[PDB]
């Protein structure tokens with residue numbers, strides 16, 4: 001294969017990227033986007049703050065741009081995300097009880113319906129759990145509605161879109177641990193009670209040289225519950241600046257991640273959280289860390305590229 005798109009296509013899997021629609025006007029960005037991936041997800045355009053800035057006032061221009069790009073270039077479209085405690089507008093945080101629940105349900109229905117038939121899979125609920133196990137302790141949904149908001153969101157999404165693959169996503173759940181265990185129980189419960197749920201998305205925002213050794217085993221146990229699994233936001237951050245050794249370790253890590261997916265029949269694929277280090281979200285969020293993607297700031301392929309190609 002000459003591109004990662006061809007590599008993934010040949011393996012019967014998806015290799016996607018998180019898109020910022022504004023960057024499509026940047027030639028090199030568009031070129032890589034068009035030729036190296038077969039799946040796209042909106043990095044921010046489909047989130048609550050971008051789609052419902054004011055209650056009952058939806059703004060789909062940006063999300064539409066991402067959707068159109070996917071259809072126009074023949075790429076699968078992944079939706080991110082309907083219910084998330086972050087990037088949730090204040091107007092929503094100011095609501096409580098029935099009023100808040102009604103806003104959540106309507107947000108889910110309106111957004112899922114708007115992209116119905118275009119978005120093939122949704123991260124319906126994102127980051128519901130806490131590192132160490134249990135529910136997240138700073139979520140407006142967890143605090144205002146309690147444990148049952150997750151099931152409500154999934155049922156509401158299914159009602160609005162009867163065929164879309166409905167997923168629950170989280171980070172720090174790639175290996176078997178307290179957090180992934182809580183998520184595992186949730187998945188098993190939902191399947192047992194017939195609650196709509198078709199997939200689990202493992203963000204996979206990892207640290208260089210720290211890929212869980214039981215990643216594949218963990219992916220397989222979830223898949224064995226009767227759902228598909230997918231790596232949704234892969235990036236492997238290192239201490240900046242980067243150097244030969246760090247980039248080498250990173251490449252080996254990318255290979256291990258893609259391999260784990262290849263080793264599980266139900267792993268739909270791997271989506272990296274961006275194309276270039278130039279725009280990666282890491283530096284601004286993790287001071288002193290970065291150089292997490294496959295292309296560097298000059299759009300030059302890093303060693304990770306060859307590793308992903310080989311892994312597929």
Ligand SMILES: O[C@@H]1[C@@H](O)[C@H](O[C@@H]2CNC[C@H](O)[C@H]2O)OC[C@H]1O
Nearest residue numbers: 043044081126169203205233273281
């Ligand atoms: O631009 C960033 C964006 O990359 C980031 O994306 C989140 C990363 N963590 C997991 C989530 O599910 C993603 O939405 O969100 C913050 C934005 O400023």
